[PDB]
Design a protein around this ligand. Structure first.
Ligand SMILES: OC[C@H]1O[C@@H](O[C@H]2[C@H](O)[C@@H](O)[C@H](O[C@H]3[C@H](O)[C@@H](O)[C@H](O[C@H]4[C@H](O)[C@@H](O)[C@H](O[C@H]5[C@H](O)[C@@H](O)[C@H](O[C@H]6[C@H](O)[C@@H](O)[C@H](O)O[C@@H]6CO)O[C@@H]5CO)O[C@@H]4CO)O[C@@H]3CO)O[C@@H]2CO)[C@H](O)[C@@H](O)[C@@H]1O
Length: 339
């Protein structure tokens, strides 16, 4: 019952003078003819949804270092490179998406700070080096900020063993391994004022002291009720006040539900689909005011039944621009209208 329309306006072409338009996809899309054609019609950047995370690239360890499994990730990078589109690297440092043995030695022992930092250098050199010149942007560090901590830092194993030095060292080493990649700090809920302030100061201070961070990634996992487009704009205004910092919108999607709500729909309510469309229109009208700093906007999924949100919350959701049958949503037409 698939109903892709090959003749409607290309998303990225509609925004060609504003910013790249990207999509996160899983590996299965690369072997599906309909998915591939839809990706290349509408998007000029991709992100591997899961297949370039540390848990996906790491195969294990021995007495002398790390062992990798790159076959699937190679297919993503080759797909982008041979089809003249960019691929954003998701992600070098991300505690929850890293296996627990990574933080212990081959004898099952928890690593000292110096041993873990040495392992981090090895990982970054190996992964960024393999793809040197082929990944235009890396999310180097993801989700290091926790606004309920007094100093703002998430108390992950990275922080507990290394303190905050792991953040700046990850950027230094990534920039050594591929000097031409744009390097991002990536996070979510950047519209919570206290978190925004922690991120702003962290990145400002890194940049001041010469750390090669080039951008902030705002995930923008949002919903039809929160945050307001004005709040997203306030984040863009503050982050873009840092000289030399660009912005990518890295994982945009818009749940039809409030977070923590027990609503559960079998079919998408039309009034929420209209609220979604109007908010996507407002969002993109706002983003077009900041094309000097916002260089890429990536949607976290090709179509609604591919959304991570369905498994994550255990219910149907319709957060993206295409329906399950590949057909355009009101949201799609709103994004085209905003262009
Ligand atoms: O991670 C495994 C799967 O990841 C998927 O993709 C990831 C991506 O790779 C990653 O980079 C990133 O990570 C997510 C985190 O791992 C996850 O824990 C986090 O949960 C968020 C949720 O996304 C977010 O929408 C939610 O927002 C709430 C907020 O918590 C709440 O405080 C706020 O409250 C406000 C009130 O609503 C308002 O009335 C009042 O005025 O102000 C309040 C604020 O003070 O409301 C918002 C929404 O209503 O918070 C939770 C955590 O608390 O989400 C991260 C990203 O959002 O993003 C992707 C998602 O995981 C992969 O695709 C998949 O394949 C992997 O298996």
């Amino acid at each position: 019952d698939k109903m892709p329309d090959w003749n409607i306006p290309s998303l990225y072409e509609s925004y060609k003078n504003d910013f790249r338009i990207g999509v996160a996809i899983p590996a299965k899309c690369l072997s599906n003819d309909t998915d591939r054609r839809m990706v290349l019609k509408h998007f000029n950047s991709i992100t591997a949804e899961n297949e370039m995370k540390p848990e996906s690239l790491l195969a294990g360890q021995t007495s002398t270092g790390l062992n990798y499994r790159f076959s699937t990730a190679d297919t993503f990078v080759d797909f982008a490179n041979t089809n003249n589109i960019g691929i954003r690297g998701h992600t070098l440092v991300w505690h929850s998406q890293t296996p627990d043995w990574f933080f212990k030695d081959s004898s099952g022992q928890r690593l000292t700070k110096d041993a873990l930092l040495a392992r981090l250098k090895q990982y970054i050199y190996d992964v960024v080096g393999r793809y040197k010149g082929k990944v235009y942007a890396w999310d180097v560090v993801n989700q290091a900020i926790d606004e309920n901590q007094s100093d703002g830092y998430r108390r992950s194993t990275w922080y507990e063993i290394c303190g905050p030095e792991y953040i700046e060292k990850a950027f230094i080493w990534a920039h050594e391994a591929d000097p031409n990649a744009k390097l991002f700090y990536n996070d979510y809920n950047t519209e919570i004022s206290k978190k925004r302030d922690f991120i702003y100061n962290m990145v400002k201070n890194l940049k001041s002291k010469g750390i090669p961070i080039h951008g902030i990634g705002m995930q923008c996992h949002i919903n039809v009720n929160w945050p307001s487009v004005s709040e997203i704009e306030n984040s863009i205004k503050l982050f873009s006040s840092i000289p030399g910092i660009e912005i990518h919108i890295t994982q945009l999607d818009m749940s039809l539900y409030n977070y923590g709500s027990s609503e559960n729909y079998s079919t998408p309510p039309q009034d929420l689909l209209q609220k979604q469309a109007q908010k996507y229109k407002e969002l993109f009208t706002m983003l077009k005011k900041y094309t000097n700093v916002v260089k890429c906007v990536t949607f976290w999924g090709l179509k609604d039944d591919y959304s991570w949100l369905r498994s994550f919350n255990g219910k149907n959701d319709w957060p993206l621009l295409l329906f399950e049958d590949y057909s355009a949503k009101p949201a799609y037409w709103a994004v085209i209208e905003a262009s």
